[PDB]
Amino acid sequence: QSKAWNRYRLPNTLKPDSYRVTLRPYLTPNDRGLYVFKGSSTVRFTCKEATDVIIIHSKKLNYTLSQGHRVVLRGVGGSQPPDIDKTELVEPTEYLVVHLKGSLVKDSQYEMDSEFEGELADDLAGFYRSEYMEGNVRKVVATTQMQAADARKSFPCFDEPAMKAEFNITLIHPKDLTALSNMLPKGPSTPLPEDPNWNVTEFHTTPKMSTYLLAFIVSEFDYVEKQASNGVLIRIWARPSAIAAGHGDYALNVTGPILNFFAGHYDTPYPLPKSDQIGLPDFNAGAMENWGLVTYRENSLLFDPLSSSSSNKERVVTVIAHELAHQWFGNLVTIEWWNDLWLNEGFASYVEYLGADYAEPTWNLKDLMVLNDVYRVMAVDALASSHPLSTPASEINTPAQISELFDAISYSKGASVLRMLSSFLSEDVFKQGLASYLHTFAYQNTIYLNLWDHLQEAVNNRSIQLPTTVRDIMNRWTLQMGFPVITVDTSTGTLSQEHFLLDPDSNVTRPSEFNYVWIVPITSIRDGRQQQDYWLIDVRAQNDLFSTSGNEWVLLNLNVTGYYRVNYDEENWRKIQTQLQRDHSAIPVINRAQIINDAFNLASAHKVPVTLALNNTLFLIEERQYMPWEAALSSLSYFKLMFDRSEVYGPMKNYLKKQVTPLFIHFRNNTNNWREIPENLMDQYSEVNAISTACSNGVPECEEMVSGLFKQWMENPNNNPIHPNLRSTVYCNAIAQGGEEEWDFAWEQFRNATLVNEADKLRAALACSKELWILNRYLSYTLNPDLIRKQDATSTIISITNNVIGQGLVWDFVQSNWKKLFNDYGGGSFSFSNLIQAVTRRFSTEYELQQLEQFKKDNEETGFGSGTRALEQALEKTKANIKWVKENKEVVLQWFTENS
Amino acid sequence: QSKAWNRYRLPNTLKPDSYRVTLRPYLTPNDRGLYVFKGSSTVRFTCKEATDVIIIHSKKLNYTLSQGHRVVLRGVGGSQPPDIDKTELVEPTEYLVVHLKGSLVKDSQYEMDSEFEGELADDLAGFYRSEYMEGNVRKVVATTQMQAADARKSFPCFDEPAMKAEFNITLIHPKDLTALSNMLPKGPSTPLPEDPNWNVTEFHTTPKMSTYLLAFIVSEFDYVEKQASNGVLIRIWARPSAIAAGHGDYALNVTGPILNFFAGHYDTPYPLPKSDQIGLPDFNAGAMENWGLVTYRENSLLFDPLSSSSSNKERVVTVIAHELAHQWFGNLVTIEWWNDLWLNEGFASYVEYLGADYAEPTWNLKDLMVLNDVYRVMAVDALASSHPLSTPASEINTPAQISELFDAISYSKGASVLRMLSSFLSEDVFKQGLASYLHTFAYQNTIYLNLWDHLQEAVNNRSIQLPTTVRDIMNRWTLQMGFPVITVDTSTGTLSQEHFLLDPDSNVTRPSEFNYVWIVPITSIRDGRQQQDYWLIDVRAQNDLFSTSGNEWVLLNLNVTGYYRVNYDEENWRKIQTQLQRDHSAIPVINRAQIINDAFNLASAHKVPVTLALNNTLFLIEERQYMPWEAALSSLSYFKLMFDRSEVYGPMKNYLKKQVTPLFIHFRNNTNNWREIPENLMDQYSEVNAISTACSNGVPECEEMVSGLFKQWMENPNNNPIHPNLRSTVYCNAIAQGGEEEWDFAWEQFRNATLVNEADKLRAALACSKELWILNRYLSYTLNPDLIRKQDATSTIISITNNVIGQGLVWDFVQSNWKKLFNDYGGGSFSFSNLIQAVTRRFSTEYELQQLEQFKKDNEETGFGSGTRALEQALEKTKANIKWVKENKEVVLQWFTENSK
Ligand SMILES: *[C@@H]1O[C@H](CO)[C@@H](O[C@@H]2O[C@H](CO)[C@@H](O[C@@H]3O[C@H](CO)[C@@H](O)[C@H](O)[C@@H]3O)[C@H](O)[C@H]2NC(C)=O)[C@H](O)[C@H]1NC(C)=O
Ligand SMILES: *[C@@H]1O[C@H](CO)[C@@H](O[C@@H]2O[C@H](CO)[C@@H](O[C@@H]3O[C@H](CO)[C@@H](O)[C@H](O)[C@@H]3O)[C@H](O)[C@H]2NC(C)=O)[C@H](O)[C@H]1NC(C)=O
Ligand SMILES: *[C@@H]1O[C@H](CO)[C@@H](O[C@@H]2O[C@H](CO)[C@@H](O)[C@H](O)[C@H]2NC(C)=O)[C@H](O)[C@H]1NC(C)=O
Ligand SMILES: *[C@@H]1O[C@H](CO)[C@@H](O[C@@H]2O[C@H](CO)[C@@H](O)[C@H](O)[C@H]2NC(C)=O)[C@H](O)[C@H]1NC(C)=O
Ligand SMILES: *[C@@H]1O[C@H](CO)[C@@H](O[C@@H]2O[C@H](CO)[C@@H](O)[C@H](O)[C@H]2NC(C)=O)[C@H](O)[C@H]1NC(C)=O
Ligand SMILES: *[C@@H]1O[C@H](CO)[C@@H](O[C@@H]2O[C@H](CO)[C@@H](O)[C@H](O)[C@H]2NC(C)=O)[C@H](O)[C@H]1NC(C)=O
Ligand SMILES: *[C@@H]1O[C@H](CO)[C@@H](O[C@@H]2O[C@H](CO)[C@@H](O)[C@H](O)[C@H]2NC(C)=O)[C@H](O)[C@H]1NC(C)=O
Ligand SMILES: *[C@@H]1O[C@H](CO)[C@@H](O)[C@H](O)[C@H]1NC(C)=O
Ligand SMILES: *[C@@H]1O[C@H](CO)[C@@H](O)[C@H](O)[C@H]1NC(C)=O
Ligand SMILES: [Zn+2]
């Protein structure tokens, strides 16, 4: 608006060099019960272009006028300090405009001192407080989450990733509590000269960081430390009680290997002197890559071996790797602007599994990436509402736009694209370019093009053959949204590409350059033996590689490395099916899951018949791996949700029971009569799946075993015999196969629950009851805050909705008590979006659509709030559901009956 | 409108004298694939008042134009027939108005020849069709059902009960099949001149009768015959296989004696040479009393001693008695209008027990009547939405209202009134008066006043002492709806009477000439010793007969003879509970059941504490008789319907489980490990009650036994180990405690079932499944006429709505397919009301009432027809339920919890 303070982007008039921030957090409420902190900061900025105004980001800061102005300007090195005209604080653009009576000459450093007072509120932003209940005592900790902005809230600073500067952090903390920051403590905490109750801790100057990664936490958390033989001191800080137990031991045992792996992959030594990972009890954000002081949710860093499932073990190892990867890529080489967030977060997501694999080589974690990210993001990208990975930097300005960029696409899509990048570049050449990128751009900001250039330079040195320059071959997958579905005409060995859209009748309004065409790297296998390689340059191309003979099957996207679905002629599909039946080993496990997942998704776009998809699920009877089974069960979930209350459910269960029985018996023998869990994490997951589906479909042995296990627990409570991994499954099936007695025992345990994980497991299991009265009684308990915590109420109601009988109960509940639910819980505590999505997920009939539409008009006056933008979405999904059921019910029903 | 055709009442200007109907039923689909019957008819009518328009009933009949008109007017006796102006067909009133260019000469007989064609569909109305399967060949049987406004569908006629006439019936039927009509065939079947393959059979002229008593059935059914002592030839006609298997043996064993008994009791001879009882595969009503050709559902007539249960045996004898009773009260003497429908249904329902008791003297079915009718109607009669036994004629005009009157009030309330009337007038005096009524108005239509006059004659003849005239005393029980509740102050022995209302806040909009007061006849017993009787003529009275001293307890309405509820003070109730726990035998078995039923209903009306009624159910643990247990289970059903989907259900089940366990074991030992059955009929019913109640509540052995028995039947499909009487409960409980396999086995057996009784049991049991998907599939099956016969469609839906899981499914189904159910399915008006009551018997929340009100607002255009009153009553009950549950949920839960332990 012709005024720099009106503009959302900092003027490039001055750039910071060094910072000195001394903040004293008062973790005790003052007058009006306000937790406030007092801070003093100074910035030695350098005048890049002669100007008359200084603009510094500042949010929720009272400031103190040391002289006639809130700030004091002093020129350094004999620099003349221009007199300050006036001080103004702009809110729309968190800016501290300090108009000066004169112009600051260029090539001269000026320091601006600033004493300020802020509120240590529980906003989970900037400098915030977190109160946890240690025993029966409230304990408050002062932590920091300066993602995107928020850094301004803590102290006056150039809050932009481009503005890199050294930061000297000093914390005045109570003598009892300990203070932590990005760097090591410069000196041991000394009693503050005044009020000896408080100590003063100074930390060594931080390597030129870009803000947003600064962190200063003062608390009483204890810690387990280990000096790695590479020079980095690994310290895992957490609640003293948990550190006293072995909860934090696993993280310390896994951090060292992960750091070493990344050091090699990044070909760079750990930039900071030490690595502290702290487990905050709350911390709604999953994790933060604060340089040196990584903050994690207590549940994602601590692993109790007696009450955490192997799934939690995967969670901690993987999340640790993601943030530890950020320490090299994203902290040493930060993005110039938030528009390139996809490159930073995406790379971290991709190399996350790479690191975890080094730590646990017997888990094959890298394989899970596809099901966890590639297929997850593929579903969203296959909509006409998708956005291109790259966005014009000018477009992103407001803080809200920055937060918007943090989409699942930015993470998974980026990781998938970068995985394809590494595959067609050969990990070795990719790593070479990455190493050069980091070294050449160490301690400075960059654009995604810089990485493309270094990769191309490595391409030339290694002389790898790429159809076009890395930039062009990557622009196709970064400047336009969506992914190509490659159809293979084996008869004439022809290859074709198209923008895959799950809804066939979708108007792709977004005008994408390259007219939605992609340079797809194609890797193929023939009769098991991998062929050479091919790059689809145009929409349609012919190559003998894809040509097949009388009994020849070709399968593209080996290990689904490339972000593209594949469609084949019906003949090739049948050849693949015959191979899967005689020996599934020929097809790599990853591609077996690909076959099932792609078939179902292609059937949704009406590119292949639904029967073909179910045909690709027939070989599961012999499959003993996890990925293939998981893919099929995930896809068949929609079928169950649509036919759970219909006749089709009968034949469907019979078919699934026939397929699961062998897998269940296999595990029963392997686990020695359900006594010893399998070793490989993948096998552990499949064992849980086997029992769950076997009992759900009605395998007799499964229900007998789960019932017996729960009964053994009922006989001897306090010593649960069910192993943590199999607890949720046994609990739900046992309660379902049992009556009021079992539910009563479970309810008692839930009320006496001591660990949140166990409590939530019991809560969901209690909703597995098959008695209408018990479910209604549970619904009444859900609303009561005393019985069910309001934070957990929405999830409990959703869990009852999942019960086939519960669907009707919850639907009447939401339709009749929307007013109460919305009015009493208008706050974010109740996610109405998730609630309405869950209650309307099975809607597949015109009657149900009429009810939902009536609900919309009936409660129109009381805005659905978070529900809005999801209720209209549910209406659209309901309409699509009606069409799908009326177009596939007969075919699906016949298939199950004849194939069961 | 003023237009006579627009009016729903036939003009009195024309009176029918005699008719000649010649229906020809085509038992093969036409080019349009629709079975169609073609017939011609001529009505001889005397012109009571000169008229220029002739109005007759015509329904779904395409009349062939003759002489440029649908009808042809011919002069009888030389009278001139005025020229026909025009013939319009008014559909709303089903009136074929034959406008004339002149006024019919007054007091002149005329004849109207009319040819017509109609659809022989499966609507179970007029001339419909019944398709049964023999071997692998479909067999079609054309039968007639004209209970109300359906004779018009078969032929143009004055379809009103008052318009009696003699009907000459000629049936052109295939030479192979046999034509059955009200009277005997007049001579041998003669070959149709056009086609020898068809036969022309005319029957003897029928005596003066109403159009709704006609029956024309052509069938290949065989029959078993046996002349009765009165000489009337009793023949049981049914499917060839059924008669060959001796399913009709029991029917022939009871029909003859029962018919003679009725004739001897009222000294009135049956005026027809034969009385054929025929069982039709497809029939809506349980049975129709068509004079000479009484029609019955196969379930109500066929009886296989090796597969039918003791209850089935009672059903057959009772139904046959009810229909034979009608042959006197309904056919020989008919009602003037449907307003006094009770005069026929009520008497036939009450005297049915007398006939059954005669045929089966070791059953004591008259004891059951107390719970079968008196208490059954008291529930609906209590609602402020009931109707006086003799509703003003003006209210009942449209055919929908006519069919609506066929409810508990016309049947049970009438029978209960007759029970009380006979009790205070003595059987001898009562039957003497009835004989005069029958002989005086034979072949004539009568009203309630006519009955009172003949009864008064017997009263004076036998010098019976009454407070006032029979008319005044019984007008209180017939001209005002509802029944009185007597408050007994044992402290001072004072009595009072007031209209019993389930909702104390319910607004009665129906005015009463007697201002809701009754000359209640009262009979009281003291410590089991009967005392002198008293008549509560005034609203309030006092007597020492009711005043108690020390620990003396007084029970009014000994053997629930009177039609009223007894409300004792807390003192008497305490003494009664003391007696029940000390020696329940002291209190009459019937009165023990009376105590449980009265206590609960009084509590539901917010007149006594709910705890009091529940307390009265603590003697059940030691009770071994059937009647007490029966009333308790029936009364606690309301609690279940109101708390089955609530937290109270758990404690309630535990309590009942505790009470039934002893009875269950007792019967186990008595039945020798469930191998034998009790000898006494009542004991057999209680044994089945024990097993069903135990399995439903959760007694472990019960669930194990029923499952094992069904498993053994699955092993040997042909040999069913379960004893016929125990099949009902075992089948249901097994299917419920079983899964898809059990449901599949039952479905296959149901489709392959032979005896209707067994098929009915399996059909109802299939609804006991606890799988939502199975119940949804079952509901779709109900609509399919091929899988479930249209006659049993609503019954199956009601069974599904009975299942707790099915309640929601059916409610949404009813809301979604009201238009289809109301239109495609006629339901014969006997249903719909039942379906509405069944789907709305669990409503206890404002949201549920809102849904019901929305249903009415969204389906007012579609119409509720017969269900109109039922839907309106539902609204009243739902509102009362909302208040009752809110005021009693906690106390009911606490009581069960404390007693369950
Ligand atoms: C944050 O801490 C760093 C040190 O870790 C501070 O940088 C230091 O700045 C002072 C001037 O303020 C430098 O002193 C100068 O030393 C040179 C000789 O090296 C001398 O010729 C000059 O006359 C002057 O005394 C000091 O060297 C420098 N230290 C380093 C290692 O660069 C920084 O100023 C602190 N932050 C802020 C905002 O003050
Ligand atoms: C906050 O500052 C206080 C004061 O410095 C710390 O308390 C401890 O103070 C004593 C000196 O008064 C020191 O430790 C003590 O010294 C003896 C030897 O004389 C030694 O055996 C013990 O360590 C003893 O406690 C030390 O300065 C200081 N800290 C320690 C390690 O004891 C207090 O610990 C400070 N709090 C934090 C969290 O840094
Ligand atoms: C900084 O100044 C703001 C604006 O004056 C203060 O905000 C006020 O304080 C109350 C709470 O005590 C807030 O609810 C209102 O937004 C403001 N009201 C008033 C009366 O001014 C803010 O409190 C100050 N900072 C701190 C840490 O206290
Ligand atoms: C974490 O490391 C500790 C050792 O610091 C483990 O304790 C033992 O050490 C070995 C090697 O790590 C483990 O394999 C053994 O299971 C432990 N005991 C023995 C006798 O060697 C500890 O198990 C590791 N994991 C956790 C979760 O604490
Ligand atoms: C029905 O049958 C009767 C008897 O055959 C037909 O004859 C009339 O009815 C009386 C009955 O006793 C006969 O005696 C008379 O000869 C007839 N009466 C008149 C007034 O004609 C009778 O016509 C037939 N019904 C019809 C056509 O109305
Ligand atoms: C109907 O009557 C028949 C014939 O009386 C009954 O069959 C039995 O016939 C044998 C013939 O020797 C007699 O010894 C029995 O006394 C008859 N039993 C009875 C109960 O009468 C038949 O049981 C009767 N009832 C049924 C159900 O058909
Ligand atoms: C119903 O419950 C009992 C009979 O089962 C009646 O008597 C009570 O019994 C309890 C338990 O022994 C005592 O604690 C109470 O004091 C008794 N009642 C009184 C009023 O003393 C009870 O009165 C009945 N409740 C009714 C009829 O409402
Ligand atoms: C709660 O659990 C603890 C630990 O198993 C047990 O000692 C205690 O008795 C339980 N309390 C109740 C009330 O069940
Ligand atoms: C049909 O008529 C013939 C005489 O033509 C007769 O023998 C036969 O029994 C009749 N059939 C029936 C069942 O009416
Ligand atoms: Zn991250």
From Swiss-Prot, chain A:
Modification after translation: Sulfated.
Carbohydrate attachment residues: N62, N168, N199, N253, N461, N507, N559, N615, N669, N752
Localization, UniProt: Cell membrane
InterPro entries hit by this protein: Aminopeptidase_N-like_N (IPR045357), Aminopeptidase_N-like_N_sf (IPR042097), ERAP1-like_C_dom (IPR024571), M1_APN-typ (IPR034016), Peptidase_M1 (IPR001930), Peptidase_M1_aminopeptidases (IPR050344), Peptidase_M1_dom (IPR014782), Peptidase_M4/M1_CTD_sf (IPR027268)
Binding residues annotated for substrate, in chain numbering: G286, A287, M288, E289, N290
GO cellular component: cytoplasm; endoplasmic reticulum-Golgi intermediate compartment; external side of plasma membrane; extracellular exosome; extracellular space; lysosomal membrane; plasma membrane; secretory granule membrane
UniProt KW keywords: Aminopeptidase, Angiogenesis, Cell membrane, Developmental protein, Differentiation, Disulfide bond, Glycoprotein, Host cell receptor for virus entry, Host-virus interaction, Hydrolase, Membrane, Metal-binding, Metalloprotease, Protease, Receptor, Signal-anchor, Sulfation, Transmembrane, Transmembrane helix, Zinc
EC number, UniProt record: 3.4.11.2
Molecular function in Gene Ontology: alanyl aminopeptidase activity; aminopeptidase activity; metalloaminopeptidase activity; metallopeptidase activity; peptide binding; signaling receptor activity; virus receptor activity; zinc ion binding
Effect on the protein of changing E225N: No change of receptor activity and HCoV-229E infection
Pfam families: ERAP1_C, Peptidase_M1, Peptidase_M1_N
Cofactor mode of binding and number, as noted: Binds 1 zinc ion per subunit.
Induction: Estradiol and IL8/interleukin-8 decrease enzymatic activity in vitro in endometrial stromal cells by 40% and 30%, respectively.
Positions marked as site (Transition state stabilizer): Y411
Tissue expression profile of the protein: Expressed in epithelial cells of the kidney, intestine, and respiratory tract; granulocytes, monocytes, fibroblasts, endothelial cells, cerebral pericytes at the blood-brain barrier, synaptic membranes of cells in the CNS. Also expressed in endometrial stromal cells, but not in the endometrial glandular cells. Found in the vasculature of tissues that undergo angiogenesis and in malignant gliomas and lymph node metastases from multiple tumor types but not in blood vessels of normal tissues. A soluble form has been found in plasma.
Any single biological process term in GO: cell differentiation
Residue numbers on the Extracellular membrane side: 1-900
Database matches in Gene3D superfamilies: 1.25.50.20, 2.60.40.1910, Neutral Protease Domain 2, tricorn interacting facor f3 domain
Region (Necessary and sufficient to mediate interaction with HCoV-229E): 222-229
Residue segments, region Metalloprotease: 3-900
Function per UniProt: Broad specificity aminopeptidase which plays a role in the final digestion of peptides generated from hydrolysis of proteins by gastric and pancreatic proteases. Also involved in the processing of various peptides including peptide hormones, such as angiotensin III and IV, neuropeptides, and chemokines. May also be involved the cleavage of peptides bound to major histocompatibility complex class II molecules of antigen presenting cells. May have a role in angiogenesis and promote cholesterol crystallization. (Microbial infection) Acts as a receptor for human coronavirus 229E/HCoV-229E. In case of human coronavirus 229E (HCoV-229E) infection, serves as receptor for HCoV-229E spike glycoprotein.
PANTHER family, per the entry: AMINOPEPTIDASE N, PROTEASE M1 ZINC METALLOPROTEASE
Additional notes on this entry: Found to serve as a receptor for tumor-homing peptides, more specifically NGR peptides. It could serve thus as a target for delivering drugs into tumors. Concentration in human hepatic bile, varies from 17.3 to 57.6 micrograms/ml.
Record-given protein name: Aminopeptidase N
Species in which this protein is naturally found: Homo sapiens (Human)
Classification of source organism: Eukaryota, Metazoa, Chordata, Craniata, Vertebrata
